[PDB]
Symmetry: C3
Subunit: 27 residues, 3 copies
Protein backbone atom coordinates (compact mmCIF):
# COMPACT_ATOMS: atom_id res chain seq x y z
CA UNK A 1 0.00 0.00 0.00
CA UNK A 2 0.88 3.67 0.12
CA UNK A 3 1.40 5.49 3.41
CA UNK A 4 -1.23 7.93 4.71
CA UNK A 5 -0.55 11.25 6.40
CA UNK A 6 0.83 11.06 9.95
CA UNK A 7 -1.12 12.54 12.87
CA UNK A 8 -1.57 16.35 12.88
CA UNK A 9 -0.64 16.91 16.50
CA UNK A 10 2.68 18.73 16.89
CA UNK A 11 4.79 15.59 17.03
CA UNK A 12 7.21 13.87 14.69
CA UNK A 13 6.72 10.30 13.61
CA UNK A 14 8.67 7.42 12.33
CA UNK A 15 7.04 4.53 10.45
CA UNK A 16 6.87 1.00 12.01
CA UNK A 17 4.84 -2.15 11.08
CA UNK A 18 2.30 -0.23 8.95
CA UNK A 19 1.66 2.51 11.50
CA UNK A 20 2.88 5.96 12.64
CA UNK A 21 4.75 5.82 16.02
CA UNK A 22 6.14 8.79 17.91
CA UNK A 23 9.84 9.59 17.34
CA UNK A 24 10.20 10.81 20.91
CA UNK A 25 9.81 7.24 22.18
CA UNK A 26 12.73 5.70 20.26
CA UNK A 27 14.80 8.72 21.31
Amino acid sequence: KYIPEAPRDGEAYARKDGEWVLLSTFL
Copy 2:
Protein backbone atom coordinates in the same frame (compact mmCIF):
# COMPACT_ATOMS: atom_id res chain seq x y z
CA LYS B 1 -4.59 12.16 2.53
CA TYR B 2 -1.21 10.64 1.85
CA ILE B 3 2.44 11.63 2.42
CA PRO B 4 4.65 12.69 -0.53
CA GLU B 5 8.20 11.66 -1.26
CA ALA B 6 10.57 13.38 1.16
CA PRO B 7 13.48 15.52 -0.07
CA ARG B 8 16.41 13.70 -1.70
CA ASP B 9 19.56 15.20 -0.20
CA GLY B 10 21.54 12.65 1.80
CA GLU B 11 19.83 13.38 5.16
CA ALA B 12 16.94 11.62 6.96
CA TYR B 13 13.45 12.99 7.65
CA ALA B 14 10.49 12.18 9.87
CA ARG B 15 6.87 13.18 9.34
CA LYS B 16 5.35 15.99 11.39
CA ASP B 17 2.39 18.42 11.12
CA GLY B 18 2.12 17.54 7.40
CA GLU B 19 5.75 18.15 6.55
CA TRP B 20 9.09 16.42 6.42
CA VAL B 21 11.42 17.66 9.13
CA LEU B 22 15.06 16.77 9.62
CA LEU B 23 15.83 14.05 12.17
CA SER B 24 18.86 15.98 13.40
CA THR B 25 16.52 18.82 14.37
CA PHE B 26 15.30 16.47 17.13
CA LEU B 27 18.54 14.66 18.02
Copy 3:
Protein backbone atom coordinates in the same frame (compact mmCIF):
# COMPACT_ATOMS: atom_id res chain seq x y z
CA LYS C 1 4.54 10.60 -6.12
CA TYR C 2 2.99 8.62 -3.29
CA ILE C 3 5.56 6.61 -1.27
CA PRO C 4 5.13 2.85 -0.62
CA GLU C 5 4.97 1.17 2.77
CA ALA C 6 8.09 0.48 4.79
CA PRO C 7 9.19 -3.16 5.32
CA ARG C 8 7.19 -5.11 7.97
CA ASP C 9 10.00 -6.12 10.32
CA GLY C 10 9.45 -4.38 13.64
CA GLU C 11 11.85 -1.48 12.99
CA ALA C 12 11.26 2.30 13.07
CA TYR C 13 11.94 3.93 9.75
CA ALA C 14 12.90 7.50 8.57
CA ARG C 15 12.69 8.56 4.83
CA LYS C 16 15.98 9.30 3.05
CA ASP C 17 16.99 9.44 -0.64
CA GLY C 18 13.72 8.01 -1.85
CA GLU C 19 14.10 4.97 0.38
CA TRP C 20 13.33 3.81 3.88
CA VAL C 21 16.30 3.91 6.33
CA LEU C 22 16.50 2.52 9.86
CA LEU C 23 16.14 5.11 12.62
CA SER C 24 18.94 3.35 14.58
CA THR C 25 21.52 4.20 11.84
CA PHE C 26 21.63 7.69 13.40
CA LEU C 27 21.01 6.94 17.10
